[PDB]
Amino acid sequence: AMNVPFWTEEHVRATLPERDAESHKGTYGTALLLAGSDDMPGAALLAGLGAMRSGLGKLVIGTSENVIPLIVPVLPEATYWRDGWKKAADAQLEETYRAIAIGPGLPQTESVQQAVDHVLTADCPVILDAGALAKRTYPKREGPVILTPHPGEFFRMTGVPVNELQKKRAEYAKEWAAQLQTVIVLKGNQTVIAFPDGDCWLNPTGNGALAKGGTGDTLTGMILGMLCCHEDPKHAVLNAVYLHGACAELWTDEHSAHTLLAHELSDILPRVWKRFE
Amino acid sequence: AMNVPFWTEEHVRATLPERDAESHKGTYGTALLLAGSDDMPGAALLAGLGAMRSGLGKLVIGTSENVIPLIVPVLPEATYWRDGWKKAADAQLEETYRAIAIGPGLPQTESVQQAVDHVLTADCPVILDAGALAKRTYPKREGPVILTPHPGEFFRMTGVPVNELQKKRAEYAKEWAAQLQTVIVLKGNQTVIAFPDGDCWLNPTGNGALAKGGTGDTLTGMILGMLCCHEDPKHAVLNAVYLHGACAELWTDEHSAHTLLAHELSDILPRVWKRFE
Amino acid sequence: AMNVPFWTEEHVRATLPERDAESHKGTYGTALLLAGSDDMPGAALLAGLGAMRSGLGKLVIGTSENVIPLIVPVLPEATYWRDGWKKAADAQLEETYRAIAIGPGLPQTESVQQAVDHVLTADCPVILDAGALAKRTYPKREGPVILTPHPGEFFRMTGVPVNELQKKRAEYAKEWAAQLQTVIVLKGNQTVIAFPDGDCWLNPTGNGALAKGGTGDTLTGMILGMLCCHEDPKHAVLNAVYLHGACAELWTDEHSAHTLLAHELSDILPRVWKRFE
Amino acid sequence: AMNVPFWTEEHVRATLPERDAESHKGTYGTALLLAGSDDMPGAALLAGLGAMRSGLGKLVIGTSENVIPLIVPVLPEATYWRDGWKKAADAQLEETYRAIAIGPGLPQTESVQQAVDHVLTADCPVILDAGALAKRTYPKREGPVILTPHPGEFFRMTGVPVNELQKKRAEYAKEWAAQLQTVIVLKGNQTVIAFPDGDCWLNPTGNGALAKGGTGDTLTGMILGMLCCHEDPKHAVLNAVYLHGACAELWTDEHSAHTLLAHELSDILPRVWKRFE
Ligand SMILES: NC(=O)C1=CN([C@@H]2O[C@H](COP(=O)(O)OP(=O)(O)OC[C@H]3O[C@@H](n4cnc5c(N)ncnc54)[C@H](O)[C@@H]3O)[C@@H](O)[C@H]2O)[C@@H](O)CC1
Ligand SMILES: NC(=O)C1=CN([C@@H]2O[C@H](COP(=O)(O)OP(=O)(O)OC[C@H]3O[C@@H](n4cnc5c(N)ncnc54)[C@H](O)[C@@H]3O)[C@@H](O)[C@H]2O)[C@@H](O)CC1
Ligand SMILES: NC(=O)C1=CN([C@@H]2O[C@H](COP(=O)(O)OP(=O)(O)OC[C@H]3O[C@@H](n4cnc5c(N)ncnc54)[C@H](O)[C@@H]3O)[C@@H](O)[C@H]2O)[C@@H](O)CC1
Ligand SMILES: NC(=O)C1=CN([C@@H]2O[C@H](COP(=O)(O)OP(=O)(O)OC[C@H]3O[C@@H](n4cnc5c(N)ncnc54)[C@H](O)[C@@H]3O)[C@@H](O)[C@H]2O)[C@@H](O)CC1
Ligand SMILES: Nc1ncnc2c1ncn2[C@@H]1O[C@H](COP(=O)(O)O)[C@@H](O)[C@H]1O
Ligand SMILES: Nc1ncnc2c1ncn2[C@@H]1O[C@H](COP(=O)(O)O)[C@@H](O)[C@H]1O
Ligand SMILES: Nc1ncnc2c1ncn2[C@@H]1O[C@H](COP(=O)(O)O)[C@@H](O)[C@H]1O
Ligand SMILES: Nc1ncnc2c1ncn2[C@@H]1O[C@H](COP(=O)(O)O)[C@@H](O)[C@H]1O
Ligand SMILES: [Mg+2]
Ligand SMILES: [Mg+2]
Ligand SMILES: [Mg+2]
Ligand SMILES: [Mg+2]
């Protein structure tokens, strides 16, 4: 009904960054990921791999003590802020980060919202997903706030029932991005990327291989990394959603859509990303 | 002697499900796996990988605290019900699952049977394997009960000695599926899939590469996942047994039958499944 | 000086076993591996992978509590006898095994020799390696005892200095196999396989890619598995040593000899073994 | 301005060692790596893999108790000196090593400098990286001391600000190698390898795929291993830096430069090294 344009291959090619010969890890920044809890530890690994695969310089993972050891053998490149997501509830961050994500595998609690409020006082883009998504408002700040709800989380945020939401996805996503003054990545087939300045796009990539636990955790990480290597954070969000879906399309060329595991999207991204360079 | 028909490539092709563009993980359900104990932890990873590879939406693994960390780095997509198989002995499940499996790597104890009795009060298909297999009867309930004995476990269930069983496999499997009113997947070369309504099939795939620890644990998981994406639970069971054996046949094209490890069946399934689409 | 014959490709092809369609894991037996200690845990994983890759039915790993979790994510198919190598020092094994190995990554202590003495009362082939190798004698028993010393361990066993040993390898290996009434696999370039009945062979495969920590741990496991699927335990030993070296030769076709890691021999064996079928 | 020559493909080919048929792990020595701490554990795995991939015989990793289990499943070939880097602060090493590295993932503390002072009393080449880099002087000793600073660490060592350093990299690196009487590998695009005898080279390989956490940790390990298989420790340093960068160039043929993870350099080295033989 709205004619929201697709973010196309041509837009991706035109906007993906270079990685210059004269750069070091500091050029691409240090990200922070606040993710993973004792009965949902895997979401931290998924998002971690997503982020380190996606062109950042360094990654600090703020997760519980019990989760740390489960990440290290698979993602040895990350370092840790021990019990970081709980510690973020107590004070403003003393360290400076290029971008921050919070929520995958975190309980949807008031302590998590406190950590959200502290993270928002930093001057960098911030992603809120999963356990960090709630019905709330957002303080005026410099850097973008990026919310990544699936339709269930959108219902939690807005009170718009899922059955109604799904009939008018882009209309609701635009309306709430504007009201909240946040980016909203409203997930699903034809994911909507709605910006608080009124720009809105649809994502043309992805398939049912993504309809399985963990794929959104991986996406949150991909957005986190891309925010560190793109000059324009809009392009980071758009390219992460696009390339995330493109990795699922590569998988289905020679593998059944029923059989993808989320972490494999990260394994596939190196070759898919190269295609768009 | 009986002319039990084979479930053939043509039957598999005709019955494997689609994964629609307009679906999400909830479309394919949340399964529960109750598996893994302190000296047999690996069976939980094997069955977990089997299940997540096999087209479910989400997987919760109910296993002991000591087993959880051993699964997460390999299968980060699963979440946990901490000490779940022990907790299931104490009360009906409060959560709703699309399908449930119990038994791989569990001790063959009365506490495990209590957990079985509680799981059976849910309205979903239930698989019982390994430590959950015992001589018993089953309450009338809506969803199918699927027993996956090898010949030793069948002897434990029925008192039919293995030497006698193996002379008349389909006859015994049919007789006991009918008596018990359960599906029986009687494993071995030419696995028998006997339904309590009298339908019975033989499986034509598989080889001696499967004659090694863990392959039945992986199968239980494959059945669990397929029950979540097939509309007809009969087809889920049949296709899981078939594709399980087909992965062993792919392996032996270029690898010795002596050298397969069970977890690799799960790694092979993506490409094998695609062949049948 | 002696004309000890090489165990050749033709001997390997003539002696490798079939894996029949009508077999199950019990056909190929349950092996026991007593290996791994707190500061040398990896040797248990190396030998475990070697063994499960090499055609056994099941593998029980008797290792310390702290080592168990380090094996499970990589080799989920093994089960455990918790603190098994220490417990073996206290009594004869109550369980029956198709073959047993002891020593990789175990401290060279009197407690380990006690565990050796208990294992020797079983009726199955037994391999002694590494920490289980000492200067001693062996009781008359039914099954073969297989010692796998490198030249340093041979010096420890016999008092023959390494410099002298290495001038007359097959002569010393034969002499001591006869004296001890054990098989001796005297490792090195042109490994000597000396039988206590006077048969003796040289191994023609392998290269300097093997000259790195862990490769002998992997070999001990390969011998353990092959003893379970070969009818003649002589052929098991000969084929394990041969195929172990052949995997290093495959590696060097496209990879530098400086860069092999022991666990990769196990990864390579599936395709190498197939070549000899 | 200086015409520092590049260490070229031809120099690498002329200087890489053979791995003779008549060698064993002892021929290539035992290295010691003192690396990894509770919130930076991964650096020990990265450097460990680097080292074992790079032609040593054995590797002992001296790291904290909590780090050990995180390494073993990925690098089972290493053994451990439990809490080794802390224990090295208390006394001269009783064991003899072919080469030693210290610092990746270690806190930059006085206790680490004490461990440095003890390691320096050994007669072998010693690498100091990361947490072991400080403003200090070095005792006259037989074996080379090899410092591997990035420009930030060089500033910490010398007081030369990074902005000034980067205008005259080889001039500063030569000056300080001479003053300190240490090798300095001054990292960055066109890494400078400055020897205390006045030889100096530039490295022509590498790209922005390396501009991400962990790649320097992997390099320290590669240098450690190469010091064990090269007769001339100068060639070890030069070839490690060259081949490290070459692995990043192989990656970018078919993968985006944004997406490399440090541990993958180690995975790539087997095939890259073979190219130069
Ligand atoms: N491996 C892990 O550690 C995992 C952790 N996860 C975490 O589990 C927590 C809960 O998130 P979940 O998303 O699993 O569960 P939720 O219960 O929050 O949301 C799922 C529900 O949202 C609705 N929904 C979602 N997508 C929809 C669509 N396209 N159309 C219509 N309705 C839709 C449905 O009502 C569905 O039942 C989060 O913290 C998440 O990060 C999940 O990602 C699963 C994997
Ligand atoms: N990695 C792990 O954690 C593993 C766990 N496992 C668990 O170990 C427990 C015991 O199960 P097992 O099956 O190992 O041992 P069992 O002792 O229960 O059954 C094996 C016996 O059954 C008979 N049998 C099985 N298949 C046969 C056939 N085709 N023909 C004739 N006789 C046959 C034989 O008597 C054989 O000795 C289960 O909980 C199982 O899930 C096993 O799957 C081994 C791997
Ligand atoms: N990843 C792990 O957990 C590892 C554990 N390992 C364990 O470490 C223990 C000690 O065994 P090691 O072999 O490392 O050390 P040892 O000190 O027992 O033996 C090595 C010595 O034997 C001699 N030697 C060996 N091969 C020779 C040859 N071809 N020619 C001449 N001399 C030769 C040399 O004197 C050499 O220094 C064992 O329990 C072993 O299983 C080792 O395999 C290293 C890897
Ligand atoms: N996975 C892990 O366990 C990791 C551990 N690491 C450890 O973290 C510790 C701190 O080392 P880091 O290097 O991360 O952080 P540092 O804060 O010590 O050094 C980074 C700073 O040095 C400067 N710098 C570095 N390279 C430069 C170049 N080419 N041009 C200009 N300026 C440059 C910049 O000021 C930059 O902010 C070390 O012990 C290191 O081994 C890091 O390697 C990150 C990964
Ligand atoms: N059928 C589908 N087609 C395209 N994308 C999908 C489909 N199912 C799920 N996804 C994507 O998978 C992710 C699910 O996120 P989450 O539910 O948070 O794990 C989102 O990026 C979705 O847009
Ligand atoms: N020789 C064989 N041919 C075909 N399938 C086999 C063979 N040996 C074992 N299997 C299969 O491997 C699995 C063994 O299950 P379990 O004993 O529970 O681990 C079952 O699915 C068997 O049907
Ligand atoms: N240069 C070489 N050529 C052939 N085999 C080797 C060589 N170096 C080591 N090996 C083999 O590697 C293993 C070393 O055993 P160990 O020292 O116990 O780890 C043995 O099987 C040796 O025969
Ligand atoms: N843009 C680049 N080109 C070449 N090498 C690089 C580049 N960025 C980083 N490196 C290398 O990556 C490593 C970084 O080390 P560190 O900062 O200690 O992790 C060094 O070996 C650098 O020389
Ligand atoms: Mg989500
Ligand atoms: Mg079973
Ligand atoms: Mg050895
Ligand atoms: Mg560094």
Q: What is the CATH number of the domain that holds A72?
A: 3.40.1190.20
Range C126-129 contact pairs with CB under 8 angstroms and sequence separation of 24 or more? C126/C99, C126/C100, C126/C101, C126/C102, C127/C99, C127/C100, C127/C101, C127/C102, C127/C103, C127/C220, C127/C223, C127/C224, C127/C227, C128/C101, C128/C102, C128/C103, C129/C101, C129/C102, C129/C103, C129/C104, C129/C216, C129/C217, C129/C220
B241 touches chain C (CB under 8 A): no
What is the strand order of the sheet B200-202 is part of? B79-82, B58-63, B30-34, B99-102, B126-128, B145-147, B183-186, B192-194, B200-202
Annotated ligand binding at C189? The verdict is yes
- Contact call for residues D167 and D175 (beta carbons, < 8 A): no
- As a whole number of Å, the CA-based R_g of chain B is 17
The single-letter code of the amino acid at D118 is H
Identity at B268, one-letter amino acid code = I
Pair of tokens at residue A190: 């034809």
Q: By the 8 A CB rule, do A253 and A236 touch? A: no
**B34, B48 in Cβ contact below 8 A?**
no
**Is A77 at the interface with chain D, CB within 8 A?**
yes
- Name which of A42, A66, A211 is nearest B19 (Cβ-Cβ): A211
Contact C185, C174 (CB under 8 A): no
Distance, in Å, from the CA atom of B153 to the CA atom of B129, rounded to the nearest integer, reads: 9
- List the single residue in C with minimal CA-CA distance to B166: C22
Say how far residue C251 (Cα) sits from the centre of its chain: 21
Q: How many CB pairs under 8 A join A and D?
A: 109
Of A66, A74, A215, the CB nearest to B73: A74
Bridge-based pairing state of the strands D79-82 and C192-194: unpaired
Cα three-residue angle B147-B148-B153, rounded to 5 degrees: 100
Backbone angle region of C112, left / alpha / beta, with phi > 0 → left and psi within -120 to 50 → alpha: alpha
Closest C-alpha among A227, A272, A237, A249 to residue A7: A237
Burial class (CB in 10 A: 0-12, 13-18, 19+), A9: middle
Helix (H), strand (E) at residue B80: strand B79-82
Among candidate residues A264, C69, C19, C29, the one with its CA nearest the CA of residue B260: C19
Which backbone phi and psi does A73 adopt, to 5 degrees? -65, -25
Cα(C75)–Cα(D45) distance, integer angstroms: 19
In the numeric block, which tokens belong to residue D33? Answer: 């790596």
Angle, CA of D186, D190 and D195, to the nearest 5°? 45
CA pair distance B95, B109, nearest whole angstrom: 24
Ligand 3 atom at minimum distance from D58 CA: 44
How far apart are alpha carbons C77 and C52 in whole angstroms?
8
Pairing label, strands A192-194, A183-186: antiparallel
**DSSP code of residue C137:** -
Nearest-Cα distance to chain D for A29, in Å, is: 9
Tokens read off for D276: 């130069």
Query: Under the phi-then-psi rule, with left for phi > 0, alpha for psi from -120 to 50, and beta for the rest, what region is C33?
Result: beta
Q: How far is residue C85's CA from residue C78's CA, in Å, rounded to a whole number?
A: 16
With CA atoms as reference, report the closest residue to A112 among A151, A64, A159, A60: A64
> Best mutation site among A68, A166, A259 for testing chain B: the one with the most B CBs within 10 Å?
A259
The SS3 call for residue C196 is: coil
Name the DSSP class of D17.
P
Contact C208 D21 (CB under 8 A): yes
Residue of A nearest to D188 (CA): A24
Instruction: Write the CB contacts of A1 (distance below 8 Å, at least 6 apart in sequence).
Output: A168, A171
Q: Name C37's bridge partners.
A: C40
Nearest to B100 by CA among B157, B24, B47: B47
The residue of chain B nearest to residue C59, with distances taken between CA atoms, is: B213
C113 to chain D, minimum CA–CA distance in Å?
A: 22
H helix or E strand, kind and range, residue C243? helix C233-254
Nearest atom within ligand 4 for CA of residue A25: 26
Q: Answer for the pair A101, A32: CB distance below 8 angstroms, yes or no.
A: yes
Q: Are A165 and A188 in contact (CB under 8 A)?
A: no
Cα(A128)–Cα(A93) distance, integer angstroms: 16
For residue C213, the 8-state DSSP code is T
**Rounded (10°) CA dihedral A253, A255, A257, A258:** 170
**Quick check: C217 and C43 in contact, CB under 8 A?**
yes
Q: Is the CB of B210 under 6 A from ligand 6?
A: yes
φ/ψ of B263, rounded to 5, equals -60, -25
CB A172 within 8 A of CB A222: no
Q: Where are the beta strands (DSSP E) in C109-195?
A: 126-128, 145-147, 183-186, 192-194
Q: Which residues have C-beta within 8 Å of that of residue D76, sequence separation ≥ 6?
A: C41, C42, C43, C45, C46, C70, C74, C214, C262, C263
**Binary contact (D212, A58; C-beta < 8 A):** yes
Contact A54, A226 (CB under 8 A): yes
C-beta atoms of B42 and C69 within 8 A: no
Task: Give the Cα separation of C205 and C8 in Å (integer).
Answer: 9
Token digits for B267?
A: 């790694």
Q: How far does C22 lie from chain D, in Å, by closest CA?
A: 35
Contact pairs from chain A to chain B, CB under 8 Å: 109
Instruction: Give the separation between CA D42 and CA D263, rounded to whole angstroms.
Output: 10
Q: From ligand 8's centre to the CA of A24, what distance in Å?
A: 6
Contact between D208 and A80 using a beta-carbon 8 Å cutoff:
no
Q: Do D20 and C214 touch (CB under 8 A)?
A: no
The DSSP bridge pattern shows strands B99-102 and B79-82 to be unpaired
C188 neighbors C169 (Cβ within 8 angstroms): yes
Report how far residue C173's alpha carbon sits from residue A255's, in angstroms, rounded to the nearest whole number: 53
**Host domain of residue A14:** 1-277
Chain length of chain A: 277
* Type of residue at D137: T
Structural domain tally of chain B? 1
Contacts of B94 (CB under 8 A, 6+ apart): none
- Within 6 Å (CB) of ligand 4, which residues are found? A 24, 26, 58, 76-79; D 40, 42-43, 104-106, 130-131, 150-152, 162, 188, 213-214, 216-217
Does the C-beta of C151 come closer than 6 Å to ligand 3? yes
For residue A44, give the amino acid letter.
A
Give the determination technique: X-ray
Nearest-angstrom CA–CA distance, A212 and B54: 11
For residue A82, the 8-state DSSP code is E
Residue listed under structure tokens 């380990």: C112
* B128, B147, B150, B266: residue to mutate for ligand 6 pocket, most atoms within 8 A of CB: B150
Tell me which residue has tokens 């599926």. Answer: B177
Give the C-alpha separation, C253 to D162, whole Å: 45
Whether C84 contacts C63, CB under 8 Å = yes
The full 3-state SS of B190-254, as one line of letters, equals CCEEECCCCCEEECCCCCHHHCCCCHHHHHHHHHHHHHHHCCCHHHHHHHHHHHHHHHHHHHHHH
Whether chain C has a CB inside 8 Å of the CB on D55: the answer is yes
Number of Cβ within 10 Å of residue A216's Cβ equals 26
How many Cα neighbours within 13 Å face the side chain of B36?
Answer: 36
Tokens 């005026």 belong to which residue? A140
Given a contact cutoff of 8 angstroms between Cβ atoms, the answer to whether D205 and D245 are in contact is yes
Query: Alpha-carbon torsion D165, D168, D169, D174, what sign?
Result: negative
Containing A61, the helix (H) or strand (E) segment is strand A58-63
User: CA of A207: which chain B residue's CA is closest?
Assistant: B21
Q: Is some CB atom of chain B closer than 8 A to the CB atom of C231?
A: no
How is the beta sheet containing C183-186 ordered, strand by strand? C79-82, C58-63, C30-34, C99-102, C126-128, C145-147, C183-186, C192-194, C200-202
**CA-CA distance, B202 to A78, in Å (whole number)?**
50
**Within chain C, how many helices (H) and strands (E) appear?**
11, 9
Burial label for A108, CB within 10 Å (0-12, 13-18, 19+), is: middle
**Length reported for chain C:** 277
CA distance C182 to chain D (A): 24
- Within chain B, residue ranges assigned H as helices are 9-15, 42-52, 68-71, 84-87, 110-120, 151-158, 162-165, 169-180, 215-229, 233-254, 263-275
CB burial readout B47-66, b (16+ within 10 A) else e: bbbbbbbbbbbbbbbbbbeb
Amino acid at B28: Y
- Cα gap A169→D3, rounded to integer Å: 63
For chain D, how many residues are written? Answer: 277
> C114 C-alpha vs ligand 3 centroid, how far in Å?
22
**Strand partners of residue A10:** none
Residues C254, C256, C262, C265, Cα dihedral to 10°: 20
What is the C-alpha separation between C248 and D270, in angstroms, rounded?
13
Here the tokens at position C156 are: 């420890």
Query: Phi and psi at residue D216, in whole multiples of 5°?
Result: -70, -30
Amino acid at A268: I
CB count within 10 Å of CB B26 equals: 15
Q: Are C103 and C128 in contact (CB under 8 A)?
A: yes
Is the CA virtual torsion D56, D59, D63, D69 positive or negative? positive
Please list the alpha-helical segments (H only) found in C53-109. Answer: 68-71, 84-87
Query: Helices C263-275 & B233-254, crossing angle to 10 degrees?
Result: 80
Q: Are C223 and C265 in contact (CB under 8 A)?
A: no
Mutate to test the pocket of ligand 6, among B185, B215, B218, B223 (most ligand atoms within 8 A of CB): B215
Q: Can you give the C-alpha Rg of chain C in angstroms?
A: 17
Chain A residues with CB under 8 Å of B271 CB are 254-255
